[PDB]
Amino acid sequence: TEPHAKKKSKISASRKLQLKTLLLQIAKQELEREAEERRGEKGRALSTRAQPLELAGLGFAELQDLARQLHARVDKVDEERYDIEAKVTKNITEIADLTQKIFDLRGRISADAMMQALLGARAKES
């Protein structure tokens, strides 16, 4: 290979660093915003999927039947939860495998001490 020009930039590395720092800050704010919005979404989903009990005016036998109905629903919802959990579990196995794959594909003396040795008393600032 032959030599080539160095990368040159219109802006200072000091400016780039400031911009990157601010970029990470706002990404972090957007992450908190996402979490808050997801909490809101969770509240609304739970309003629909698990609506409040109406117990007023149910007699003894009606209450016995309701408890049996709710207990049956517990079984059904647990089964649905299990099914999504099973998909999450399979994704974990896939994530672990792909993470290993990409890792594989991707696979002194300090200036202080050096300056003291080379320059002796002429090293002050450094």
Binding site: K7, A13, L17, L19, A27, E30, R108, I109, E125, S126
Partner: protein, 155 residues
């Protein structure tokens, strides 16, 4: 690179003058006024170190910006500051926030949107240079691995 370059920009003149005096010791007698593995080895051994030729070559390659196989004074300053950030999991979550269309890449539009959201005055040069800084393989976008290098050492 970026965090080291910034440290170099902030060196005082007297600091740079002292580094120049050190650089002159390294390059004494060199054909092209530059530090090759020959000069680097000589000085490292003078300093009591015993690097292999491979370690020597690697030390040069780390800071060589023009592929000369040698270290000039500007590259020497970077070598000096190098000789003295967030976790990957944390950066992975932040990456997702840049990636607004969820395609696994940060494009120029997504970078622009993020930069404007900072509240700083964003010039066209700010946008073009950051993208060029981040995009190592010249496809005009920042992939996950490029993003990690791009943010390396950023607080």
């Amino acid at each position: 690179d970026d965090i080291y370059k910034a440290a170099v920009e902030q060196l005082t003149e007297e600091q740079k003058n002292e580094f120049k005096a050190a650089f002159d010791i390294f390059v004494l007698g060199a054909e092209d006024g530059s530090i090759s593995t020959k000069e680097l080895g000589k000085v490292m051994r003078m300093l009591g170190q015993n690097p292999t030729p491979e370690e020597l070559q690697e030390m040069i390659d780390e800071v060589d910006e023009d592929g000369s196989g040698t270290v000039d004074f500007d590259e020497f300053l970077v070598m000096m500051v190098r000789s003295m950030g967030k976790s990957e999991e944390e950066l992975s979550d932040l990456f997702r926030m840049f990636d607004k269309n969820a395609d696994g890449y940060i494009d120029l539009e997504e970078l622009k949107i993020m930069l404007q959201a900072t509240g700083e005055t964003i010039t066209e040069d700010d946008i073009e240079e950051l993208m060029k800084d981040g995009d190592k393989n010249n496809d005009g976008r920042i992939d996950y691995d490029e993003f990690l290098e791009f943010m390396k050492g950023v607080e």
